[PDB]
From a paper:
[name], predicted to contain five transmembrane helices and localized to the inner membranes of mitochondria, is involved in the regulation of membrane potential and maintenance of redox homeostasis under abiotic stress. When heterologously expressed in giant E. coli spheroplasts, [name] displays stretch-activated gating in excised patches and channel properties similar to those of E. coli MscS (EcMscS), which demonstrates that [name] forms a functional mechanosensitive channel. The overall architecture and domain organization of the heptameric AtMSL1 channel resemble those of the EcMscS channel. Akin to TM3 in EcMscS, the innermost helix TM5 is kinked such that TM5a lines the pore and TM5b runs tangentially to the central pore axis and connects to the middle and C-terminal domains, which are located in the [name] matrix.
Residue numbers in the entry:
A (entry chain B), B (entry chain A), C (entry chain G), D (entry chain C), E (entry chain F), F (entry chain D), ...: 203 to 229, 236 to 269, 276 to 491
Amino acid sequence: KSFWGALEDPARYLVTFIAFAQIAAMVAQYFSPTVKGAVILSLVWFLYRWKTNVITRMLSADREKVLTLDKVSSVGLFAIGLMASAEACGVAVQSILTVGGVGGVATAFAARDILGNVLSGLSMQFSRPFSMGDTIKAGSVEGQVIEMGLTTTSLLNAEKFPVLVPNSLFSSQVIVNKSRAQWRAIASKIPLQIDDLDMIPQISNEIKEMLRSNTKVFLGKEAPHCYLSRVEKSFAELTIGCNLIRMGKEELYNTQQEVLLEAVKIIKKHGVSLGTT
Amino acid sequence: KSFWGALEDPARYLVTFIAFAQIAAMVAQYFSPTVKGAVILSLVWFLYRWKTNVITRMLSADREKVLTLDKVSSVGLFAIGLMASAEACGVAVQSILTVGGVGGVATAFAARDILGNVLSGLSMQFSRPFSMGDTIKAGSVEGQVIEMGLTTTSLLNAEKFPVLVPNSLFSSQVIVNKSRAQWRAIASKIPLQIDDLDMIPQISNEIKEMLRSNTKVFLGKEAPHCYLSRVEKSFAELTIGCNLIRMGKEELYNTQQEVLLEAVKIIKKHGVSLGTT
Amino acid sequence: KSFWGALEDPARYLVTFIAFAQIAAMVAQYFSPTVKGAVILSLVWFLYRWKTNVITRMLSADREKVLTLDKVSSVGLFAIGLMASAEACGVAVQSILTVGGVGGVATAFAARDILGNVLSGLSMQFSRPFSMGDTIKAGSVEGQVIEMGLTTTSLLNAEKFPVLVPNSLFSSQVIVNKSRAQWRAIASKIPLQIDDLDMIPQISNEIKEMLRSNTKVFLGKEAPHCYLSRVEKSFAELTIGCNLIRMGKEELYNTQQEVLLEAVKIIKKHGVSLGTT
Amino acid sequence: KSFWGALEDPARYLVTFIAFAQIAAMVAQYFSPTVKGAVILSLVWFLYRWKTNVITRMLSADREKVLTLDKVSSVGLFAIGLMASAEACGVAVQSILTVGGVGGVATAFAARDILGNVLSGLSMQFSRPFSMGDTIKAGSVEGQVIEMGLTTTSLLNAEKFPVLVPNSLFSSQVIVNKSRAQWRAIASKIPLQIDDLDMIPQISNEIKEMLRSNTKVFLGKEAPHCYLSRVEKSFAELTIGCNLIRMGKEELYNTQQEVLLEAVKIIKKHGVSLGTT
Amino acid sequence: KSFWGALEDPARYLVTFIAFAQIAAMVAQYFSPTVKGAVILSLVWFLYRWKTNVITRMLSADREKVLTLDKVSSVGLFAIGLMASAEACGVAVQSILTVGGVGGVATAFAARDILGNVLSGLSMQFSRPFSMGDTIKAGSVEGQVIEMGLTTTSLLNAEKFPVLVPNSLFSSQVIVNKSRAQWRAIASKIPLQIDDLDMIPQISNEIKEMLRSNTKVFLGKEAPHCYLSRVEKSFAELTIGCNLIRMGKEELYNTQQEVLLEAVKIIKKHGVSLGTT
Amino acid sequence: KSFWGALEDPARYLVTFIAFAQIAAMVAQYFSPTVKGAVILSLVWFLYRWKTNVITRMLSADREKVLTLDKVSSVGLFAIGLMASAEACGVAVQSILTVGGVGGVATAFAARDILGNVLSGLSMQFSRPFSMGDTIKAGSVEGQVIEMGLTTTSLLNAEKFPVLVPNSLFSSQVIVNKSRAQWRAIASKIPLQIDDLDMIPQISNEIKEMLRSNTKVFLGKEAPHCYLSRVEKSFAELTIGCNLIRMGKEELYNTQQEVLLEAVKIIKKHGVSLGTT
Amino acid sequence: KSFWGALEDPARYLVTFIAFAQIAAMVAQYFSPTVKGAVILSLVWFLYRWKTNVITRMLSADREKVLTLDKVSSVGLFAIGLMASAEACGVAVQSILTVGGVGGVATAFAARDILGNVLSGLSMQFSRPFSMGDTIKAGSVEGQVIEMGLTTTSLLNAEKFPVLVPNSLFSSQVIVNKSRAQWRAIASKIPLQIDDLDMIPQISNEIKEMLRSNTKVFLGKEAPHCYLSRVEKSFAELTIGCNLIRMGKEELYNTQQEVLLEAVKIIKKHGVSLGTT
């Protein structure tokens, strides 16, 4: 019915058997082998009793999970009981133990991925690299964290599909956390159709002035830049960039578009025109 | 005929032999080695009897499977019986045990893929990452789940061919579940042949208005966007995008086409024309 | 001459020697070491006798195979006999056993590919992923199965060359079975030179009607689609697709060509013309 | 309450039990097995007492970390206590020890990444390859170091997102330290539309003169170069380059732009014009 | 001088020593350790004698090979003799045996490639995937087999250079045998500049007729095909293909050229012209 | 204070204890276990004393290094002392030894990279593949050697940044030494716009003459070449090349430019003009 | 001074000590442990004496090599002596032996690359795949062999730089030997601007005639070919090829150029002109 009976029955059988053997030998002397064999077999029987009670208790309340647990536990208990009984009796100890050891190492390397996922889930439970809702990028996958488990994490990627990442990928690869950034950084390239480069400095400086006179820029770390990155026949390329304050994602788009339009306005104000890549 | 006879014949032979040896020694004292050897050899004979009964019982009802099982089980039983008998007799114990151990580890690493498939099938039976009929994408393969087994999963890919994925690929790679998405997300890029960028804001805003005034859009998480992503000589690129409600797959196509046509209509309404990439 | 003589010569020599030793000790007491040494050496001699009889029997009927088997078996038997004799005598047991164990693990990892091929051949004999004549695609190779063995499969690829695939590639990679598909799926893209997109809906719908009014289409799972996938200056791209009934391979080509010609006919009927990618 | 009580309670119980057993045997002689069993069980109980005191002491002041530590430590202590008690009693020693050993090697290979990160963090604590604030580039990631830990380093990449690099990547890959450079090096390519190559030497020399007559160049290691790297119909390519003094990052951009404009000025002074790649 | 002397010198020394020790102990009793030590040391001396005789016999007839064999065999014999003598004497048995075991496993993993080549050479000696003269393609290499060895195969590649392929590449990769094909297969693509697609069927059918009315085609497996694979503005692409009888390599070229010219003739007969990709 | 006291305190305690036990047993006989336990515990205490003296001596003169060494050494000493004391007492020997062994192999595989770097640093100390100042190229990195250590080498790459290469990369990859070359080799390709190829020989020969009549060419190994590598409509490509004497890096550039200009001069002298790729 | 003294000092000390102990026990009986300890410690001292003599002898004649050898040998000897002395005394045998074994396997896997290089150098000393001066191509590297060692080979690549290839790359990869070819093979492609393909056969045949009437062609294996590989609007591509006799490298260039010019001459003789790819 419970653990109490599942113990009491084998315990009373074992005490009965050892008390029988004691007065079977007192009034040919292999008390130790038989007593150890009885202890091993009774303990195996008690473990079987407890296992059946528990997964019968679990099915008296997620059901094929209970059947899989029952089958796997019966396999494991049969293996352990066979090894321990062959060692208690003394018949073919090293042979059966070697078989069991090579089976154990087969199973232990075959299960390196499940164990990796579990151990990496725990390691992530210690050094939290992200939290629920953060937009992360792990190797090839990227999206919003929607579930954190012990063997897998669940993301929502750019097409808004739920992705399932095994937790052993967060220990061997770098993790980008797009939700903990305190300032953003934009950079673009504008092509110019220009032959009189004598006004590439002026334009450049003016643009930088515009980027410092713009709200939503961050002048704390790096200054806005706009330099000539390559030249060619009636062609030039300006590389613009700046840092922006911590903003949303529609405001980032609006600021990018606004900076680009103001830059092209400054460029066309000096009589220059855009080039063709 | 059954397990009962397959046991009683060796059990009665063993009891006969040990009862013979007892009164062969009472009225030179190696009772333990001979008795352990008899137990080992009788147990091997009983296992052979039971194996033959079972795969003769299985062939008295998927036939080359039974022959393969018979051959593999005979190989394994010969190995185990040789090891155990050499250990019971005492002749070249460690030599034969070392040979058997290196053979076991050869077989145990050679079989890492079959064991990986089985263990990953069980792990998937616990944490179900998909179900029958779901459209998944696992690494390089993608399609509709049509069969779930213990060592392989079966998909139907985009050309409508049945693919057979070993289950050890669902533990080391990310799984995208296209059938559990609750809203979709579309994004496109429109090129414009424009020289007066002074109307890129207006157009943009108008398009966004259109995407919010459209049924089948999802305004719960992110707002529709339409920003200028790159500019060039008489050329510009608008990046449009939005989220859509949970819809089928022909309605997704229809909505994409409709959004694209309405956007081009708004663009041409402002006197702008499409560009050429 | 046979197994009978190959056994009764060493068996009679061993019985003679142990009967000699018994009355050599009865009328200095190392009966056990000498008897175990005699058993080991006689058993090694009997195994040599049986091996020579068998591969002499095999060469009295595929000949360099027999010579290779003879050489490999003599190597293995020399190794096993040396280990067992050094353990029976008692001279340098652990040294020679360690040498033999490191040689065994060298050979057991050096042979991981042959063992992988054999074990994967058996695993495929259980869960048959294809049969003789099927057109499969395994990773980088594809063709018609023309032979199925235990360590290799033989295909006929697209250039009609016989390919030899090691069977350990069918356990770590996905297998596409092009011969078990129950319906096909075609998809194409048509470019249009169009400036009045006001007739992209009509055309689209008409094409879909054509794909549903065509025999050899499969309306069981997905509906035919034809949507606008990208637009550009006097340019548009229609993505067409449908499912087809289970057909041959020349009928699939004919149906593709027919669908393409009918689609272009519908397109040109509305005054539109094809574009240039 | 503390370690003192957590020790004295089991120590006094053990001393009581061994003093009982001594006069239980003096006035059947298995003093050693029972005494060793009592020592093992008392030590396991004391370790449990100390563990509960410590992680109860830690929760009487970063809380789910304490719960995870408690669970992991209870798992480990149960494993160790089971092994040691089965070895003290003598029941199924080698079986349980083999099970525990294969479980230990499973866990020890499953945890190769966490251990790699920790050991590489220590190795980096010895041979410091960078410090806080340095701009490093490790394999595929690059940015400013913002945090240095034992199992992970934190960077700020080019988009100004915090990246989390596992410390086992700094032992197998090269690390570029962009903050310890003492002089910079610029190099560019200018295309020329030229048919009279008889003035490619002159131009070249003049440009080099310009690069040596420029402040912010470093003439300590290598001389400025400007050579003809490829020629073609009315086309040529000059490869320019030099070293610059240790400067900031906006001054590097300004110097690049200035050198490029001066070079194009020299080129156009000789009647040559820029070409088109 | 020979094996006879190399044995009867150590054998007579050993018999002399054991006969001395027997009457040294009969008229302090460590007969077994000294006798086993004498047997081990005499056997090591005999092995040294035999090794020197053999590689002196081999150098009395490919010479640096003999010197390398001598050095390697002396290294191995020193290792084995040191282990066995330390185990016979009894001084630091487990220490020296552990050193020797870790050295053996170092050497056994360092030599995984040589052993792989040898074992794969034997496996290829059983399942012959090609023979001398066959044109094979193994992974990245392709050419005519000009030599087959035990650790390497020799090919002649397309530039007519001798390539040396390690035999462990024929067990992990697929092998294409270009010399066992029984029929060939050609396929080509012809671009057409056509606006009236109303004659794409006719042309197609005619071409197929031409491919069936041609000798050197194989109508046993698949029928000749010619279908429209893609269309575009005044552009179309016909995909032609067929099987050819088993022919040489200059006849294959001639047949390809002939089929291509006849197809273009049929195409231009219908007033169509070739297009431009 | 020193090693002398750190030894003579535990040595005198141990001698006192064994002299006590001797006359505690002479006037119940477990002299060996208690004496071995005392030796082990005294030796552990002495090692602790010596460790504390040394890293207190090192901190009485590169400080966090000393703290890390102290912590790591205390961890290691606790592990070793626990193992040795549990083995001396006799309580749970095999259990604790198995735990320690699996921990040791965990740490020994987790530290394969640090050990690889150290062993490869030593191997490089024997077979010196470069020296300080040499310009090397190792796999993906290239630059001037600026520091050679035991676990890492330091380079200065093309952008003049200090790179830190782990020394385990110089044992698995090829190393190019750009500072030990004794002659250089240049090769270029010139396109020609030519329709009368009847003067491609002449030009070619003339160019070769020019390359042999030029100082700074090396006529010791290979002769200068200039051949026609591909032809096309009014287009041809000449592939030129030669060896140059051992020269600097600005002279190599000057020689390349000079050879290119002289070749184009010879080409235009024959009425040919350059083509357009 | 030499090996003689380095042996006769420890040998005389050991004989003195055992002769002392014998009459210390004759007129408490632990002769075996003390004698084995004395033998082990004397042997360790003798090995230290011999090591110091040898590397003092080597430094009395490539010097930092001797210091590295001295340090490494002292480390190894300390390890071996500690293990053997702890095993002779009997204090913490299995603990120290386990520590030493895990250290040995750490070092034995950390040194897999050095051992691979050495073993592959020996394997190459047996099956010589090239000799000094041969032009080989191993994987990604190619050049002339300029030095052959035991752990590395030295090449001279195409830029005439000395490359250093680890010898473990010649066992896992294919080796192309450009210096053992007996005939060469050239192949080229000529584009034609042709609309009347009725003269593609004639031209083709004529070209082949030219390739058979040319000296320096090899008509032993394959016949010269020239076939039409692809056609297009006013465009065709002829694929030419042949085998050439064993020639140098400037004669190969001359023959290529000559064949190309003669082919273009034949092509233009038939009124055809070259096309434009």
